[PDB]
Subunit: 403 residues, 3 copies
């Protein structure tokens, strides 16, 4: 457990070194933020009552997923039935029909829960508890709590009239809240790929204090902060349309990226052959390079390289592509049998939208909420991705600690 | 037959009660409009020659559908072949590949028929006959006749330079013409789901006088009314693109709505359990609530509840979702064997875009044709949906009368 | 071989007759342009070393195609596996999952190769060699060389600040470069349909001098010519999104057009029956009408009619629809066994975006680069399509000559 605590120290250390003003770091804020994330981890991953609450929220999500599967079962019929496994076997699981439509249903549901005020009610509680404990501003705290369920570009919408005039520290924290977390739609998508829901739900909740933690470490507050569809069926329709667009984007990206990686590996096998390494692939490079990082967060020495392949791929590309390559390692047909703790660490370290491509996404979604602040987003973009990555790594170290 | 005639009376009665000026109702207009819709029903559903003309137009449509299926058979190959039924059985029918591509072909065809002037030629005849018999204005009569073949947002395009300056009664009638009818694309889609084409074609034609009927009952005229692609291949391309966008929208909606209903039923089973009704579902509620309405339009007492499930679902959601749940009741594997008359009544009462979500659609499509008239559309939106619903119910009562 | 040389003469003759100023035709330009296209044909289709270089570039493309297929194999699983052929046979090949996703991968790859400067490097060499040999301007020469790999609306992007002010001859040549060629995305798509890659690669390269040839014949220069994503992963993402949109457009078009042709044939069988020709179809008309044209470019007398069906369909619709009907003639289950030379001629004569529908496309893509020049594009549109068609026919005659 000493390797984990040192891992937490190193991650905190990098944040301080990369700070904009280490002397401006509020010790109440970053102290409690780490305290909450650690206590939350101790709660739902260690203590009996906390584990019972986590398995109860996950089973509820797992039921919602199955209910939404009635929709895709209607559209694609027997292509998503059980006979697909008899005829095709492992290839019977058609990713395009099994996972992608889940993004559509969950986007429509969340859109409904927003219209009913259910989402706002939960966000107001989680967000209000953070600002009264960390001293963070109202707007950045709501966006942090919102990011537990929705994406990086949808979370600030709950405080969109406060975005164009919020401080650079607030705006940075807003960027970090979305980079450290995921969305409810893709969450259910990853769960359909074999990723344990308990880990996804946990990592999503720990993202709110964790996102604020490294946001106020690398960018402390130095300024002075301040302070709809016609019906429920329209809300569902709008959410379904937004999910469809997302589902198409994710699908095209996976076809391209995986294909590109396959092209890269083919070239790496030829270039590597010139130096006596014809078996050279992208996984080997990412694995060999992220193995120390994986070893630092609590992954065993003999599993650090394989774990480095997935964590590295999540960074250089995105977490969806990483999960796509990590999903086979969660079944009985896995090429490498990993320990249950390592499976948890990778699941937590991948659960985040933290990647270089998300900077252009933050410029698009969050940038449209404050067009005169696009210059500040592009400037703090790199620092925000790093801050988001550290939050995922910390959540993985905490998870590995209590497991 | 006395229950049907009383049904017609009640439907007419509600329209008068909900009128904007019952004293301004032109008895020539609403008298002939009901006369035409009833005579049209008597024509193609009773008399020998009229039935021969209806079965001839439906077989032509059925052939066009099969011709368009050569396109989807090319793209999806064996996934839409006969071997799918051998391997999967009932689940062999893949809705996404069987029904959705039909929207693309029929949208491209109608776009072609517009370029050739074939559509305008038929509309000018049907629309001109209505205005000379009902006294309705030129523009609202053309949009009424256009709505037989095209959707609510495409029909007013034949009279789009007259929309921004037409009276509130004209604009309301335009809204009602599209709410009371469907489109040629989705028509072929419903036909591919097992819905009898003869009913769909009939209901589509009866929508023109029926739409004007309840438009001039709930909103009589109190003011004084007034009065392109480069080639045919481009027209087909533009229509195909519009159909594709529609096909994606419908598909995502069905995945979401059906999934949401599945989620609602799961919750209704838990909430209902608190009051000793664990088998409580959405179908039971909609059925129990729309049973008197179904019984009023001519559905037998022992079939009013089941029929109420579909009619209610068409209202609270849309007719596509309703048809999706009603389609299994048209096959030999139906959970409840319905009478041939009841099957007709449901088919006519569902054949319409009349739902609450269509108000936002009218604001989008029709609203773009008259941006300064969006306030009037949103105001008369609710009344227009009711007026559109009554037209479908009347067409169902007339159909049930002559059957 | 005398029929081929006469074919080249006739094609050149039509260009001179349709010229804007036959007396303004630069004999250095059009002389060398035909010389290069003919020599290029003599190079990679006749001489040993040239054939070895063509088979080497095609095998590289064929490997890239297979690497990209790892992406679609992930998304669609067993629907693109080998068991599909066992269960369905010929219908096992699902076009929607086999060919369409290739457009997505190749669009993402080209987008990456642009970010790395690899594309610009090759274009600068091929484009620079043309302008120093033909005397053509810098901008139109780069767009000509760019068109070898990318589409008609993407090629002028390498010289987009020179488009609004370039002469009518330059703008026309730019239009012709894209009409005479295809794109790298659809190229790999056609290759997946059975079309020989060697022919597609060859025709793509011969399009650059061939496009300029008939551009400076039908529109000689009479005036005086003048003279980015944040990272590589964003470039791949943007290219994947553009490919997805293209893949959806192509798919919807094929469903519609093939379905429309099926509808046309059904009507032609009824109309033709009135004149004692009930077997009358669209293929017969296009075949009987384009048979002299096919016979002129080097197709045997007994194969000119069948070849006329495909060439005609490429013109009246597009090359994708033509390739879709020509692809079965490349397998062992072909209804008509064609000679290897005829298979090459059709492959070269179809390899082009030259169709009437591309005028509206040039108005959209190229028109957005110069909004005040849309009037000139629409004016020279028809002449440009003809000029693009002649370039494909010439490349087919040259190919048939050396084979
Ligand atoms: C298919 C998967 C295979 C794995 C391949 C992994 C390769 C990753 C390459 C990353 O390259 C850098 O990414 C930054 C991302 O933004 C860019 O910064 C750009 O954007 C920054 C953010 O604002 C600015 O600070 C910079 O000035 C600006 O160059 C930068 O140019 C670019 O060199
Ligand atoms: C998945 C299927 C499950 C079945 C569920 C069925 C539930 C239906 C709920 C309908 O709710 C109402 O719908 C109106 C629709 O427009 C809204 O009116 C709104 O729009 C009207 C039209 O302009 C205005 O008159 C109103 O002021 C404005 O509130 C209104 O707010 C809303 O309460
Ligand atoms: C599914 C496949 C079945 C095969 C069917 C084949 C039928 C082909 C019909 C072509 O018709 C012409 O195409 C031109 C294409 O543009 C149009 O020119 C239009 O555009 C030109 C280009 O700018 C202008 O010169 C013209 O004035 C303008 O009429 C023209 O109107 C139109 O009559
Ligand atoms: N709601 C969502 C879901 C996804 N994404 C972007 O898509 C990538 C893969 O999920 C994520 O890495 C991404 F975050 F970049 C997004 O921006 N918003
Ligand atoms: N041409 C069309 C077709 C459909 N729709 C809308 O989609 C719902 C289901 O068909 C219809 O209920 C709807 F009407 F709302 C539309 O607006 N226009
Ligand atoms: N990159 C591309 C690819 C295709 N297209 C258009 O689509 C038709 C079929 O490929 C082509 O005929 C077309 F050219 F018209 C395009 O414009 N640009
Ligand atoms: Na989030
Ligand atoms: Na209509
Ligand atoms: Na090109």
């Amino acid at each position: 457990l000493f390797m984990s605590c040192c891992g937490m120290a190193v991650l905190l250390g990098i944040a301080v070194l990369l700070s904009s003003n280490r002397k401006a770091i509020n010790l109440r804020t970053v102290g409690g933020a780490f305290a909450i994330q650690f206590s939350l981890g101790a709660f739902i991953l260690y203590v009996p009552w906390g584990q019972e609450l986590l398995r109860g929220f996950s089973d509820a999500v797992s039921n919602v997923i199955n209910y939404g599967n009635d929709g895709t079962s209607f559209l694609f019929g027997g292509l998503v039935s059980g006979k697909m496994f008899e005829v095709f076997g492992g290839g019977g699981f058609i990713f395009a029909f099994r996972v992608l439509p889940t993004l559509i249903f969950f986007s429509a549901l969340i859109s409904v829960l927003y219209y009913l005020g259910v989402m706002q009610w939960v966000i107001r509680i989680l967000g209000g508890g953070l600002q009264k404990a960390l001293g963070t501003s109202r707007a950045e705290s709501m966006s942090a709590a919102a990011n537990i369920f929705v994406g990086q570009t949808e979370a600030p919408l709950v405080v969109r009239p406060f975005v164009p005039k919020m401080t650079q520290s607030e705006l940075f924290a807003v960027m970090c809240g979305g980079l450290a977390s995921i969305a409810g739609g893709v969450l259910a998508g990853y769960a359909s790929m074999g990723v344990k829901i308990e880990y996804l739900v946990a990592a999503s909740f720990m993202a709110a204090p964790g996102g604020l933690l490294f946001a106020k470490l690398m960018m402390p507050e130095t300024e002075k902060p301040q302070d709809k569809p016609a019906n429920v069926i329209d809300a569902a329709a709008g959410g379904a349309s937004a999910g469809l667009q997302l589902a198409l984007n994710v699908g095209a990206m996976l076809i391209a990226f995986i294909g590109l990686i396959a092209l890269i590996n083919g070239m790496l096998g030829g270039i590597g052959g010139w130096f006596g390494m014809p078996e050279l692939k992208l996984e080997m490079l990412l694995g060999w390079l992220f193995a120390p990082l994986a070893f630092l967060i609590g992954v065993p020495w003999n599993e650090a390289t394989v774990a480095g392949e997935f964590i590295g791929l999540k960074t250089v590309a995105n977490e969806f592509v990483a999960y796509s390559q990590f999903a086979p390692y969660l079944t009985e047909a896995a090429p490498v049998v990993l320990s249950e703790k390592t499976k948890a660490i990778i699941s937590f370290a991948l659960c985040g939208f933290a990647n270089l491509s998300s900077i252009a996404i933050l410029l698009g979604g969050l940038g449209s909420l404050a067009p005169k602040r696009r210059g500040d987003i592009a400037r703090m973009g790199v620092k925000a991705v790093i801050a988001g990555t550290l939050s995922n790594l910390m959540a993985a170290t905490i998870a590995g600690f209590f497991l």
